[PDB]
């Protein structure tokens, strides 16, 4: 009987947990690209003048 | 008299739960390796980046 019932929905658990991990990985990905580029920007505008 | 009518629906139910048995196992090994395999997906899709 639970043999089936708790693997459905350590089944969805699983991919809900995942879609998560998906979420974060590509974000902070995109952020810290944003920073290097700010980073670099904030250089540039102390030197230039 | 009643020594053989009872035999009979016992064999009868003996049958009836075997093949419940049967099913049950065979749907848990089923369910518990597509499990299994979601967990390592899961896994595999937190980690590539």
């Known amino acids: 009987l639970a043999g ?3 693997a459905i929905i350590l ?3 699983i991919i809900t ?3 998560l991990a998906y979420v ?3 974000m902070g990905l995109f ?3 944003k920073a ?3 980073i670099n920007k904030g250089e540039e505008t ?3 003048a």
Do not use: P, R
Request: proline share 0%; hydrophobic share 50%.
């Open 17 to 19: 947990a995942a879609v």
């Open 24 to 26: 974060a990985v590509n």
């Open 36 to 38: 290097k580029t700010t």
């Open 46 to 48: 102390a030197s230039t």
């Open 31 to 33: 952020v810290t690209q």
């Open 4 to 6: 089936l019932d708790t």
């Open 11 to 13: 089944i969805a658990f």
